[PDB]
Design an enzyme around this catalytic site. Structure first.
Site, PDB file in Angstrom:
ATOM      1  N   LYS D 157      12.296   7.276  10.313  1.00 45.15           N
ATOM      2  CA  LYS D 157      11.974   6.408   9.183  1.00 45.15           C
ATOM      3  C   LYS D 157      11.187   6.935   8.083  1.00 45.15           C
ATOM      4  N   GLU D 183       1.176  -0.907   8.702  1.00 49.23           N
ATOM      5  CA  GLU D 183       1.560   0.412   9.034  1.00 49.23           C
ATOM      6  C   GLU D 183       0.657   1.163   9.949  1.00 49.23           C
ATOM      7  N   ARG D 184       1.084   2.153  10.732  1.00 47.85           N
ATOM      8  CA  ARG D 184       0.306   2.874  11.709  1.00 47.85           C
ATOM      9  C   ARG D 184      -0.466   3.936  11.137  1.00 47.85           C
TER      10      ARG D 184
END
Lengths: 507, 187, 470, 469
Positions: D157, D183-184
């Site tokens: 991604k 988001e990470r």
């Protein structure tokens, strides 16, 4: 134990000592809850059913579920101006739309107000949002043709006026394109003669954002298929009561032409999102659903809506509103609940396949999973006659082509069938958003059936087509005219057609 | 102006009754007449199977209300409004549940506390009063709301005592300590 | 009964509740009448919820209803008209005109509801019936006083087969017929009415050999269920109090399932076993017993069924499979072949089959036909990869036969000249039995396959052979 | 107006207040819980009545004393916008997560806003170039266009969004907005640094890239309205100023996902198999606030995490409706070592379905699709039996398709560890020429391996020469 919130001990004791029933809990009722763009108010002990209750916030919401506890009112607005301790005043009038020939070349939402600044709707009547289907007495058999740019669909699957045929398939498989072919050929009848060959087409777009729909109408204005049509919208960002009400108020706009003895055709895109709106609507008013979380009476809504398009007797002008539902299956999911209901209602299918889209048949054409439950005689008699062995070659072809892909051989006669079935398959192809009148759909299907596409090779189908239409334009353009106006082939007409096909049988 | 409203379902019906009678006074009178009529109905055997267990219709309930207003002096018409609310909701069985909670709210607004000094045996009158003097002295009551502590016999407890009220408890029960002694000495 | 005062409490779709007063309360399965600008609104009581408060299902639409409107008791269920003046005429759910020839002609009335005939009454035997079609007469075990079941998909030509059956059975039948259409379209209503004006089965003057009850699918779901019951009670009067034969006919009965499933969720139950009604067993049963051949008379049903996605392992189609005596299954594939009717005779079943049940000649012929066609279906996969040539000469002959027999089940009908085009052809019970035997013995296993295209009797095949020769 | 009240309930993360005042604020207003560890900023979603609301909680919900003061501040939470919010990182409350002092701003705008109307929004497509061949061929990107990615996340991604930033957003002269909702945070740190190094953030001052990150360790309500925060910033540039923008999102599934959790707590019944019944409504409103207006024109690229890679899932399904082009990307395709990880038999666009990208282009996609579908349809007969048991004609097509299949493999310029290999990039016009040739069999006669992980037509030839030595 727990009892309803109107029977609560603080609200109830004051009522006994001030005002209670009559013009405060009878014509009025006082809101007590609100969230999710949905409120529920206490009172309204007298109120019409499906009536419109105007909240004192400058919000109006119709009420479809009534309870002696909390009457559940669906707001057409946001809740960030609707409050607890507001009063609601009854309109006293059920939800209604302007109908006129002054909705033409104009975009309107489900409240029949312009949403593109083309200003006032000149309306000749108002009509009702919920209206029962016509009976047994106002009914006439359907035999009226409808022109579509895809020849195989019009000929095998009889596209009439006063009948419902379901275009079904996944997204971006040209769900939109089949309908748009129909609309586009109707420039020709619209311009042309005879009042009863005229569709004032009504386009319904539910759960489709503002940006996508606005590009679309500009497209129809290029091709001169918008300046007589009506555009109804209910975008996704707009509330779920509003997405549900768009198909049922579009219905009235087609129903007025039907009434006057003119004819119209209604595209119901997306019937699946109406069903999604309805789910939200019933589960926040608390109605136990059936499978998939869609309510029990989802089918009752869908059956009633579709049945507002049917043909009438000559008293009501021979008029028909005609319907084409549009259903977006999840994945070709036709065993899902909402597709099983629609299916039942509709006596034909305009089946599309995803694999075939990819194969180059854009927009995809599948007449082997198409059905016609009723007799076929609501298309051009002529296109049906030429296309008389088209069923038998395409259905026989499927079996021999399947077999051939297992490495087992067969006799020369079956490979004559097989070979022909390939020549035919190429014919169908033609790009989306393109017209193809009936007048030039009778030659090609004659040509294919009499082995005049069997004189050429697999990629010389396009080159043959170019010369044959050119030949018919010089010599047999009278032949073209008789086919459109009168729609019937005789030996004389078929003999001329034969000369034409032989002349460029090679190339 | 609820002095300490209860959330629980029908601790709210108590809240509603209180505010209404508090702004039109006569709450000590109301509650007192109410407690008397509730005790004389339950100990009458007609409604000792029929208001003790609700089993009457809608229409049959209203006619119960009509026989009830002979039975005591209504004393405040907001308790007559309670009879209309319950007859309409089709029970007469959670009639005394609202009354009991209303009573607590009423004595709380006046500034009186009701507590308990649960023990497995009764103590000295000396013991009870010292415990009272200590609680008022201690920084857990400002000396603004009056004191009642009620000794009761519970069978749970095995000796020692627990003083309870307001969710403040002072725990010197032995019952628990004995149980833990056994556990640790069978380890 | 005398006047009963109830007040509406809630309009929630169809579901409408009432607040009746004590000691003057209706009972379950009554018909309530409400004065309305919608005529007389009728509510069928379906529950009591306690405290002098009921929960009902509507039988007429709920548009512009005002809470607090006075609710009457008829004193009993909706009573429709039954007669022998109900022949031809079109009748709705509440027994109210939809053919608009003035009120519906009655001698007597009875309530929609009634009791399923008792075991002491029963005089039920199975005696050979026929329709005039070859696949049906030979290879389908229809019996008289049976409960025939036309299983099939949507649009496989369901309307055509049904048209052909009424066209045949009714004119020939000494009795009458009763046609009920449960939740079918207004397209279908004129078309059924139209087809039978033309064949002469319906005459405006005299009696008719068929009756009509057209109930349509825009009608509230509670009302949708009792279109079936309305029609059913007329069949009973024919059987009982006239002592005549009648042949009941229903269209589609899946619509009957569907209709209970909707009003089930709203009544507060859960529709369990894949979103279909729980009360299927008892409602199905009511219907089945009610249609019987007693000492009073004979009523034989031919019932239309729609199988969602040709799925017979969904619980709704499958229960019904057991309850319909003489099942048939129609498939899409046979229609596309130009084979008429859409019937596959390798899917017809009755619960018990022998040589005494259907008779000795009949059994033996019908078994031999099925094995030749069944061996072909088995061999088709094998032949796809290995090829015909890896099997025997014999295997090839069982295959060549199965195909000639297969197109011997084609028969174009006169009312499918609007559908197909080819003239009408009919074959009796006698003509089919005698002739199919000849073929298996090999007397016509030299006549081309396409000379069995579009034929009736043996005679047509010979005439069509000459046509391929010339 | 300040409305003093108490916090009655901490029913999960959707805390409820009961005010001791007979006034109430309107829904979508703000409340501050006066706790000795800071504040919580919460937003009203229900009125239940008797002066007890239910408020969605956007700040951590442990340590709330029931009986603790609340104050009514009035109206929506306000973010910071302007030319001075450029290079900055914003959480959900207008607060930075990289510090450097606060966000410098001029205007603070409500996060709850109205979306521009129909008269004011029409879709466009004016043809941008992606240095990525597979996109150009199958679903060509364009200005105004609405792009969508599907299937799993962490399969490639992130690599793909960065390639897009690399070509189109470093050649975009407007601002560009990155909003990754929940988001990470590791990947976030990596992205901030690299962007600042490659110059597109500089200090707190003027920038061609600005950033917004949700933190996904925060409570459900905060995750929901990260999405709302990031939309406010985009609105400002596009709308008020009227300057052009871009927008990249990884993942917006997160937004929908958060909604289903809170649904249960609010008073609603959650729609079946763990979604919300207000699914359609929320999804439309978010995609209507960033789509092409008339005051600006913004190309948005949206990435949807799919918990099974199936689009029959309703969350991905109603997304797919609001896009003009799609490039469904799938996990299986990654594990097969195909980068770009985009499906070739599942990418489509409504400008390539009607020849609005040109006849030669349409013709070039059409054949490519037909070959590739032949291959999958006859794939059972292909593994179980070989190719000398099939017709020669059939065997030729399958042979060409495999070669086309390899050719779509190209490493990203941003990959050097995600593919191993330093990328190769081609133009839109170059990609078309290359394929055209290939259909005509010119370069079907040299290894398949020569087509795998290389650029242009020239590069293929050049690796075949390598393979012969």
């Amino acid at each position: 134990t727990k009892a309803q919130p109107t029977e609560v001990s603080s609200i109830l004791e004051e009522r006994i000592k001030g005002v209670s029933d009559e013009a405060n809990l009878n014509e009025t009722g006082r809101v007590l809850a609100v969230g999710d763009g949905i409120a529920r108010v206490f009172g309204l002990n007298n109120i019409q059913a499906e009536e419109l209750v105007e909240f004192s916030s400058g919000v109006k919401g119709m009420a479809l579920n009534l309870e002696p506890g909390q009457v559940g009112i669906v707001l057409f607005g946001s809740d960030r101006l609707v409050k607890e301790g507001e009063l609601v005043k009854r309109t006293g009038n059920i939800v209604d739309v302007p109908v006129g020939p002054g909705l033409l070349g104009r975009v309107v939402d489900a409240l029949g107000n312009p949403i593109d600044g083309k200003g006032p709707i000149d309306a000749a009547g108002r009509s009702r949002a919920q209206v029962k289907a016509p009976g047994i007495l106002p009914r006439r058999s359907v035999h009226e043709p409808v022109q579509t740019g895809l020849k195989a669909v019009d000929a095998l699957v009889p596209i009439g006026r006063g009948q419902r045929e379901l275009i079904i398939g996944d997204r971006q498989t040209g769900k939109t394109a089949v309908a748009l072919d129909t609309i586009l050929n109707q420039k020709r009848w619209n311009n042309g003669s005879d009042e009863s060959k005229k569709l004032y087409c009504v386009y319904v777009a539910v759960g489709q954002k503002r940006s996508t729909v606005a590009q679309l109408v500009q497209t129809l204005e290029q091709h001169d298929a918008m300046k007589y049509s009506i555009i109804v919208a209910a975008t996704a960002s707009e509330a779920a009561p509003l997405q549900y009400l768009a198909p049922f108020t579009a219905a009235s706009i087609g129903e007025w032409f039907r009434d006057n003895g003119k004819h119209a055709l209604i595209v119901y895109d997306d019937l699946s999102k109406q069903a999604v709106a309805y789910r939200q609507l019933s589960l926040l008013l608390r109605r136990p659903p059936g499978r998939e979380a869609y309510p029990g009476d989802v089918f009752y809504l869908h059956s009633r809506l579709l049945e507002r398009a049917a043909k009438l007797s000559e008293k009501e002008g021979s008029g028909s509103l005609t319907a084409l539902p549009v259903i977006e299956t999840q994945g070709g999911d036709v065993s899902a609940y909402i597709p099983t209901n629609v299916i039942s209602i509709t006596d034909g299918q305009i089946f599309l396949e995803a694999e075939l889209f990819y194969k180059g048949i854009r927009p995809a054409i599948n007449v082997g999973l198409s059905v016609s439950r009723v007799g076929s005689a609501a298309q051009v008699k002529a296109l049906k006659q030429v296309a008389g062995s088209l069923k038998l070659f395409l259905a026989q072809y499927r079996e021999v082509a399947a077999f051939a892909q297992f490495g087992s051989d067969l006799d020369a006669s079956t490979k004559q069938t097989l070979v022909r079935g390939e020549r035919l398959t190429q014919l169908l192809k033609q790009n989306q958003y393109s017209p193809l009148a009936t007048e030039e759909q009778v030659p090609l299907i004659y040509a294919g059936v009499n082995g005049h596409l069997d004189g050429i090779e697999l990629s010389r189908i396009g080159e043959f087509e170019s010369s044959f239409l050119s030949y018919l334009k010089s010599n047999h353009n009278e032949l073209l005219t008789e086919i459109r106006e009168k729609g019937e082939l005789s030996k004389e007409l078929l003999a001329s057609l034969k000369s034409a096909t032989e002349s460029f049988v090679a190339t | 102006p609820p002095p300490v409203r209860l959330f629980g379902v029908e601790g709210t019906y108590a809240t509603a009754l209180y505010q209404a009678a508090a702004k039109n006074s006569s709450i000590d009178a109301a509650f007192q007449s109410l407690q008397k009529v509730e005790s004389t109905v339950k100990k009458n055997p007609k409604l000792g199977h029929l208001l003790l267990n609700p089993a009457l219709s809608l229409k049959d309930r209203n006619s119960v209300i009509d026989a009830i207003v002979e039975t005591h002096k209504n004393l405040d018409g907001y308790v007559v409004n309670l009879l209309k609310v319950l007859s309409e909701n089709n029970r007469l069985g959670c009639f005394e549940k609202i009354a009991s909670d209303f009573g607590v709210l009423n004595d709380a607004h006046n500034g009186l506390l009701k507590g308990t000094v649960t023990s497995a045996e009764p103590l000295d009158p000396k013991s009870f009063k010292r415990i009272e003097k200590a609680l008022s002295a201690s920084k857990l009551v400002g000396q603004g709301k009056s004191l009642k502590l009620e000794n009761v016999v519970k069978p749970e407890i095995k000796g020692g005592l627990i003083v309870e009220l307001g969710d403040k408890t002072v725990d010197l029960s032995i019952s628990t300590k004995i149980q833990k002694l056994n556990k640790v000495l069978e380890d | 009964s005398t006047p009963i005062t109830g007040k509406v409490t809630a309009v929630i779709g169809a579901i409408v509740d009432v607040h009746f007063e004590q000691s003057e309360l209706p009972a379950i399965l009554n018909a309530l009448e409400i004065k309305t600008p919608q005529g007389k609104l009728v509510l069928e009581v379906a529950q009591h919820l306690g405290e002098n408060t009921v929960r009902t299902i509507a039988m007429d639409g709920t548009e512009g209803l005002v809470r607090g409107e006075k609710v009457l008791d008829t004193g009993g269920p909706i009573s429709v008209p039954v007669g022998r003046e109900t022949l031809g005429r079109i009748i709705n759910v509440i027994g109210e005109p939809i053919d608009e020839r003035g009120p519906i002609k009655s001698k007597l009335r009875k309530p929609i509801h009634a009791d399923p005939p008792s075991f002491a009454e029963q005089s039920t035997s199975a005696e050979i019936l026929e329709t005039g079609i070859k696949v049906v007469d030979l290879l389908a075990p229809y019996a008289r006083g049976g409960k025939i079941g036309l299983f099939g998909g949507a649009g496989v030509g369901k309307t055509v087969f049904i048209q052909e059956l009424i066209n045949n059975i009714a004119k020939a039948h000494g009795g009458f017929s009763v046609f009920t259409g449960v939740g079918e379209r207004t397209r279908e209503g004129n078309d059924l009415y139209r087809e039978m004006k033309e064949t002469g089965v319906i005459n405006l003057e005299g009696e008719s050999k068929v009756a009509l009850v057209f109930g349509q699918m825009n009608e509230p779901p509670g009302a949708r269920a009792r279109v079936a019951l309305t029609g059913l009670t007329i069949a009973e009067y024919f059987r009982d109090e006239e002592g005549q034969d009648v042949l009941l006919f229903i269209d589609n009965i899946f619509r009957f399932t569907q209709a209970g499933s909707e009003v089930s969720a709203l009544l507060g139950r859960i529709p369990s076993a894949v979103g279909y009604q729980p009360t299927l067993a008892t409602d199905m049963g009511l219907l089945q017993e009610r249609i019987t051949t007693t000492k009073k008379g004979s009523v034989t049903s031919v019932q239309a069924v729609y199988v969602p996605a040709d799925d017979l392992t969904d619980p709704a189609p499958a229960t019904t499979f057991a309850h319909l005596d003489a099942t048939t299954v129609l498939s899409r594939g046979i229609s596309e072949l130009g084979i008429y009717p859409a019937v596959d005779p390798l899917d017809s079943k009755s619960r018990l089959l022998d040589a005494a049940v259907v008779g000795q000649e009949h059994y033996d012929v019908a078994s031999k036909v099925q094995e030749t066609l069944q061996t072909y279906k088995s061999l088709q996969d094998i032949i796809a990869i290995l090829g015909m040539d890896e099997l025997s000469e014999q295997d090839k002959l069982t295959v060549e036969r199965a195909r000639k027999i297969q197109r011997f089940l084609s028969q174009p009908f006169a009312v499918a000249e609007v559908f197909t085009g080819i003239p009408g052809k009919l074959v009796r019970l006698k003509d089919t039995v005698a002739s199919f035997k000849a073929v298996l013995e090999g007397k016509y296993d030299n006549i081309p396959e396409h000379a069995f295209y579009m034929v009736g009797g043996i005679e047509d095949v010979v005439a069509k052979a000459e046509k391929l020769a010339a």
